[PDB]
Amino acid sequence: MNQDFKVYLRLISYLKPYWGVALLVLIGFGMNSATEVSVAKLIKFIIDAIQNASRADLDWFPLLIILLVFFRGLGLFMGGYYTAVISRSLVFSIRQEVYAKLLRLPAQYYLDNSSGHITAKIMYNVEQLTAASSESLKTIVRDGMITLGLLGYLFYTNWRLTICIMVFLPVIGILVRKASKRMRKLSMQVQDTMGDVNHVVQESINGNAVVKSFAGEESEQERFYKSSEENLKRGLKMVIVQNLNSPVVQVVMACAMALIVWLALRPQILGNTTAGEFVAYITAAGLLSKPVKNLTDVNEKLQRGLAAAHSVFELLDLPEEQNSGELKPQLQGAIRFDHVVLNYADGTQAIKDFSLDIRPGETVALVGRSGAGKTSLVNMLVRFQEVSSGQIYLDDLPIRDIELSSLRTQIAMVNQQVVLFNRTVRENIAYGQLHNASDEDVIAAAKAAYAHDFIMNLPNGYDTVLGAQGLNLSGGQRQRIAIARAILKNAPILILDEATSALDNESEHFIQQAFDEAMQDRTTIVIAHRLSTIENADRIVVMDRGQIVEQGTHQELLAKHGAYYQLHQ
Amino acid sequence: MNQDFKVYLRLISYLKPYWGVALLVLIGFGMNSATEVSVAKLIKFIIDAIQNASRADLDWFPLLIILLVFFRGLGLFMGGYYTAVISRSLVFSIRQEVYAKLLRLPAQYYLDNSSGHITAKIMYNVEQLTAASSESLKTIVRDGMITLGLLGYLFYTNWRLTICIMVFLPVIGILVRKASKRMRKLSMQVQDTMGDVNHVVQESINGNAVVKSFAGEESEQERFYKSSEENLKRGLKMVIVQNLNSPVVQVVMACAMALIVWLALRPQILGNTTAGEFVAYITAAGLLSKPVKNLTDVNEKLQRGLAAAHSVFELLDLPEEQNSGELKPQLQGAIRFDHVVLNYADGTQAIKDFSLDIRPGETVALVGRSGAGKTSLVNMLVRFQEVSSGQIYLDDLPIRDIELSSLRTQIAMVNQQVVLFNRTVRENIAYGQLHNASDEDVIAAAKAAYAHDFIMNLPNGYDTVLGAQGLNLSGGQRQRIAIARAILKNAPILILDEATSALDNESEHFIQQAFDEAMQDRTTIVIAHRLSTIENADRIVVMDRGQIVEQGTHQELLAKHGAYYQLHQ
């Protein structure tokens, strides 16, 4: 339960480059505090000048008005503006850090956690951090200082009476604590339910074709309501708790007021400046009412931001993709699987004691049933999945010794399920590490794949902004953009995971003919089911439930009368 | 520029079932207004009882404290709580309406607009509507009434002086308007940039494999910063405008105060109850300072919510999927394409004068190059794309005459790019219209596809919660879940758009053997490139750039020595 202090301290580490502007908020809120205590002083002055008859003093009051207010504004702005600067800026730094963390999270994270839930963390939670911090830091400092000024003033004015207020403080302290802990639990619940609403909406957007074909609209609406309504009945409860706590505190303050007043309304009243001194105390006691109601109202906002900071720090403390390395060039591309075993988070054993040695500039074809672990094997080469027992040596170097970005930039991949961005055709080909390729480099790539001619037929050529998943292009078309992207990469190691599955006989013929000219001392791993493209591979690896069955050339395996010979049914 | 009134009125149509609780906020904020005006009255009373020596009257002051505060809280809660109820509830209704609208948006919307941009509309914008409305309605009503009470009180107290305040109002009015219009433009900019940040993050999540393989992290970070920073320098500008407007208004109020005071500090002061009457006016003038600063501070929050309501109403007024119909059963499934033409939003002509007549319980195979318009044609049958010229008659009934949900529920679809949810295996098979299928129905479907045995090998059988895109399953595996889903549907019309492209020779053999038993007077359209599965089709349609080339049986077309004969290379 003490974990709040740990989160508070962590947050403070971020406001180290803001110490300069931090005192600029204290100066500003210190003078606004000075302006509120000066109100009580002015009411005593205006009475004393009317009582002890001093019109000469009263002539100054109009000049004092346009001065107290001017000096308030100048301090109120200095305090308010810099608070926002510190807050909004500090949160911008967190938004960056949280995003950077995300890009460092492994492939399993992305698989286990939906877009909606992930989004709510960087969006809703970091946005809640902004609002809560920019309003709580403002109120807590501005109205906190005001309270401290007026408490000080009441002590200088009459410490005998002000000291009776301190006995009523453990009541308020217990009342604010009970409400605070209740609203924190609710803050946790209001943010989770919000990530749930985000999840429901994001999924509906992704699966719009299934939602439409299978008429799932009523069912999506139902689950949207379910999560939407929980989120509503939770924020309502939080508001009831808030809107009920602040006045109960005001009433337990009024009881301290009346008791202090009944003692101040004891026989000997002719001591203080009749009205002047008496009214000044009552005015400074009332000038305290509003800044305190503000301090109790900010508690909802404060519990909300604490729940969000806890979520942000949790995200930033998640285990991420392990990266410690060296910048090797992969040269030609020798690959060695030494007693490799691949276990998925869920305990599935996709690869079992797989051992294979690929020589540089060799075309090795992975063939087998679905569930053989072909994609699983190839995914290990780019560290999408970490080796759990065994080793992968790329040029006799343990794969994990190579710096992650140095490995990836050297291994070209044509994934089984083609992934495209909502960017131009050119931006999709010259993506990431290829974002410095010239227009001529892009056209060269699209020509190497059978992509150039269809690109030229699109409404805007290479500048046709592709839709959501490039779903404004046909099946085989999206597939050739992915090939163009990998060809442009021109990497020592190439990976073709069902790269032709959506291509017509004339596209498949040109691309395979253009992949004969792409054995430029380039090691390539082909996962194909069309026994025609497999046929010309240097080595054929028959896989079954993460193990090798057979190995060898198209002739060798057909002569063996086994699995490969039987696959020629 | 007047469009704000149109948005305001629209919003009012939502608070028709809240008229009951609406007066409960006026009662509550009316008594809190009565409590603030009673402060000025009490300060006059406390002075008058001290001046005109009435200790008997002063004995009541302690009871009045615990009464004014008690009656404030009871009104402040009644006003504050019901405001939140009305606000949060009204917005919940909008969140539902906005979501319902979304599910009614066409397939092109989903293609043209990214998940991130769409999300920001239902999430960020509807969340901004909540915050802005629940805080502006509260402040505008509570502090609006207070201002009206104190203005009234100052008129009863001294209307000769209070009337001089009205000449200073067109100054404040011009000052608040200039600031208001400036913050509105900024509110527009702060929300758009937020949808941009959402877009960048959502894309990064979807394309994590490309971001990883092509090392696009630095580039994603850059664009995240670019949109993140714009959003920061815009909210900062809005805050500067706010934090500078409120005090300038306070100073132009102080000038009206000093002028009213210099007239009240003219020779004849011995008229009013010396302190009593004078102080009461000054106190009620100062009790006005804070609720007015609140009314000028709420302007930022108000411009933010207006920009969001404008966005929400724009979303709700978008053209949606046209739906006017009749509940026909599609019976056996006769389909007639009459001089059909398909033009995509962007002007591409995917289908040109396509005419074809399918008889019920016939297997018609669509064959041709990529870019033939096979997917385009099949997509029209489920109204994913509307016919632009020509007609589609399903059982001699114009397709648009059939009610949308009635068409879709009767046409089973196995899409080219398989789409799966982050739900259990069973929930993915028995999705939407099939969400009432029993466990035995699900197992029957997965057995009909080659799915049952691999499902049984997964960590949790039919209860294995599938990942993001079902990417915790292999290629051919995800494909068989989609087949299972369509088999479970058991529809009169079946559509197989490259439904076997990821299946091994033994899965492809079982499924095609299990699809021979799925010609139960069922019309099926097969888009295949494996000339083996096409071979047994009743009719073969050779397509090229949205036109038919050749038509006929496997024998007829091979004997024709044309395109189909040439495809047998």
Ligand SMILES: CCCCc1ccc(S(=O)(=O)Nc2ccc(NC(=O)CCC(=O)Nc3ccc(NS(=O)(=O)c4ccc(CCCC)cc4)c(C(=O)O)c3)cc2C(=O)O)cc1
């Ligand atoms: C300690 C624990 C308990 C707390 C407690 C205390 C007291 C009670 S109670 O039941 O007696 N109640 C209350 C008792 C007292 C008060 N308040 C006051 O006596 C102070 C009111 C006031 O006169 N405030 C003011 C005046 C002049 C200003 N400034 S000025 O004179 O320079 C000026 C400038 C500009 C204008 C207007 C410009 C436009 C024309 C007017 C005046 C400014 C400014 O600038 O902020 C502000 C409030 C209350 C209340 O219940 O709310 C109960 C509980």
Ligand SMILES: Nc1ncnc2c1ncn2[C@@H]1O[C@H](COP(=O)(O)OP(=O)(O)NP(=O)(O)O)[C@@H](O)[C@H]1O
């Ligand atoms: N992330 C994952 N978590 C758990 N199990 C997984 C995951 N990815 C794959 N598997 C399982 O591991 C086995 C082999 O997977 P996979 O490597 O994709 O096979 P494959 O040979 O590429 N098959 P396919 O592409 O369909 O012809 C299958 O039973 C998968 O469901």
Ligand SMILES: Nc1ncnc2c1ncn2[C@@H]1O[C@H](COP(=O)(O)OP(=O)(O)NP(=O)(O)O)[C@@H](O)[C@H]1O
């Ligand atoms: N939403 C869209 N907007 C614009 N053009 C599109 C859209 N969808 C498809 N097209 C284009 O229309 C043509 C035919 O599309 P499509 O119907 O998907 O062909 P296909 O025959 O299924 N090809 P394939 O699946 O790759 O073998 C192609 O040139 C596409 O890029």
Ligand SMILES: [Mg+2]
């Ligand atoms: Mg695979």
Ligand SMILES: [Mg+2]
């Ligand atoms: Mg297609």
